[PDB]
């Protein structure tokens, strides 16, 4: 609620942004494993069973 109040107030509002371009050279040179890595996404699983 407090956050919503500050948002309504215009005091603190939504934002998102891309990464500074210096990473462009650093990352092309990774191009995978590194000290300044890209984060990761994937999936897991689920399953259920039902007795008759």
């Amino acid at each position: 609620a407090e956050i919503k109040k500050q948002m309504e107030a215009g005091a603190l509002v939504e934002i998102a942004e891309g990464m500074a371009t210096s990473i462009a050279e650093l990352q092309e040179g990774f191009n995978g494993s590194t000290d300044n890595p890209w984060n990761e996404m994937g999936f897991r699983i689920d399953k259920q069973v039902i007795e008759a």
Binding site: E14, A16, A24, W38, E40
Partner: protein, 52 residues
């Protein structure tokens, strides 16, 4: 500015995902990552508008 994601996946997992569930899921990981990037842009557009 940049935006970028890592898949970080193994081998045996896909071999079994295919044999067991009919999915290689490398394509799925690709899907997830690319999807997430597009979702993020959609929000940046909206969020920047609301901000401004």
């Amino acid at each position: 500015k940049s935006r970028q994601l890592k898949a970080a996946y193994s081998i045996e997992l896909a071999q079994d995902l295919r044999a067991v569930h009919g999915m290689d899921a490398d394509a799925e990981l690709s899907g997830i990552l690319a999807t997430e990037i597009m979702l993020e842009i959609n929000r940046e557009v909206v969020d920047w508008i609301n901000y401004s």
